[PDB]
Symmetry: C3
Subunit: 244 residues, 3 copies
């Protein structure tokens, strides 16, 4: 469809300047835009498996949530060498929307907000990430929606009894670090995100913040599935999932 | 009246230590604070026009909201040379109360909060700037007050619906940078401030924050007018505005 | 009971990672943690008086809220010499739980929250410190509770009329710096803490925050008494308070 034109469409949904400080968003690996494309792949992470499987299926435009490299390099060996080899031989464009996709209207965090039908939801953090608002319902109803739609067996740190109509906070991905938990404990009764260390569990219990670990995977793939749908039913392309 | 004493009065209303980190407040240019003062000028800005006009109208004490220099210098040429020449040649004192006037009780942000009759108003930012509270009324009633008392045709970024009794955030001056907007969006449904950039507009629509740009000038001058009157009523001394 | 066991108990109640960045918590002075402890002393502060008193009374394990040193040294003279000499000659162990005892469930801040029976209390600051919630009652009832259970004559900065069912912020210790006040003013109608500076007073008046200074001693010692009793109840040793 011309890569240039797909990218411009994605940057219309998720403007690049929504990305948090130092987020490596946009064109990752690629020369020759203007080239038309057939199979557009979509994955969470540009792991080698995902890059291999994209060549195997003749994907010529890989879209990932997570950037290829977080930190810059000037030597190319080991794993990064193979990933680039496959991508450069096969002329497969690799593009990324990371936090700009987590932050935009109807992005990964809005999707969680909508799922739980949060009342008057606002961004959680100063950088635009996450969403917080009232869950009009009970904690048990919150748990059912979560078990149904996000993750079947979520770790629940029930640090406090939860009244109906509590403030629910959600963060798609890794959101349960010690400092994240302290911050959100000021602003919410229940916090739904991924990756609960043992220390964070204890911290949550001490502060009285109820935490639900739905894993970083399930909370990201929920909104990513949605973005895939929005893509294929807006573009005449043919679009595959590579790690769902 | 005498210069020492006008300053003392101004600092009683707006104590210097209210000023945010790094703000150049207080005496800008002047050598003899015992100098009796016959005419006092007030301006938003110590512009060359304001300064020329001050000298031409025989102003011997010039008060400005904005300081002469944000960033220190060690060479004097061009515009700053011309400004200092006029102030020094005519022994016009130049004095500023900047953010301390924005932050103090009845100062520039209180003036806005009071206008909109905000319910249980509180400071917006960690540094004391801005006010946020509940506007007991409809979005419509709010716009009308804006158009009538602040600025006739404000650009409105109406990202989605605003219910009555919404959280209204106000900031006198330049309040619509990207980081400000991300921050206020956590705290308010509506944001009234000045100087909106195209990128900030997009950000507000993405985040769901309703923004009303009334210009930095209009939002500052409203409170400056109040500060002028308050000075008139308490001081026997001719007082003119040079800037508005 | 061995020293490492008492320490392990304390750290169960107040885990070390609860402490704010840079806080010097844990073993202050001591070498032999297998030491059988017969007499536990407890104090707000490892002052020279307290360390002398502890030796006079055969204390072999000294717990203090405040650390011995906040900033590191590499020279040993004056007061710090006299302190360490006593601790070392008598192999008295000195151990501290500082902000971790402030932040933990039923720690110093929670004790305040519980006393005023705050409605849905939450941590006040990003780092876990302080509690804030609704005081179900009048400003007057709130003062009677203060006067009776914390400090007899608290200084009150009545910056504003306070309605019933106000948002009350509590911070055990020194919470009344200018930056703390600007911040709490965003979040509360009334701030109960200790050690009010003159500039902080004016600042609170300007912003409309009602401040009650019950001193840093009285707000800390209240929770410390609870933790003493708790240490008595659980551990079997005799426990004397050297500071209160």
């Amino acid at each position: 469809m011309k890569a240039k034109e797909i990218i411009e469409f994605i940057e219309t949904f998720a403007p690049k300047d929504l990305a948090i400080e130092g987020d490596n968003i946009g064109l990752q690996v690629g020369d020759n835009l203007d080239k038309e494309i057939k199979k557009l792949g979509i994955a969470l992470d540009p792991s080698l498996s995902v890059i291999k499987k994209a060549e195997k299926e003749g994907v010529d435009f890989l879209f990932t949530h997570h950037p290829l490299l977080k930190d810059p390099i000037r030597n190319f060996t080991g794993v990064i060498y193979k990933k680039l080899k496959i991508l450069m031989e096969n002329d497969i464009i690799l593009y990324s929307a990371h936090t700009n996709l987590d932050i935009c209207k109807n992005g990964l965090n809005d999707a969680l907000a909508e799922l739980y039908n949060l009342e008057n939801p606002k961004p959680l953090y100063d950088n635009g990430l996450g969403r917080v608002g009232i869950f009009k319902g009970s904690f048990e109803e919150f748990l059912e929606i979560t078990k149904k739609y996000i993750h079947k067996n979520p770790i629940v740190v029930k640090s406090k009894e939860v009244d109906d109509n509590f403030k629910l906070a959600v963060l798609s991905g890794y959101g349960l670090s010690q400092s994240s938990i302290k911050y959100v404990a000021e602003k919410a009764d229940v916090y739904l995100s991924g990756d609960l260390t043992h220390h964070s569990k204890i911290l949550a219990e001490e502060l009285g913040l109820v935490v639900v670990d739905a894993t970083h995977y399930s909370t990201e793939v929920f909104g990513l599935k949605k973005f895939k749908e929005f893509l294929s039913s807006n573009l005449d392309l043919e679009i595959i999932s590579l790690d769902f």
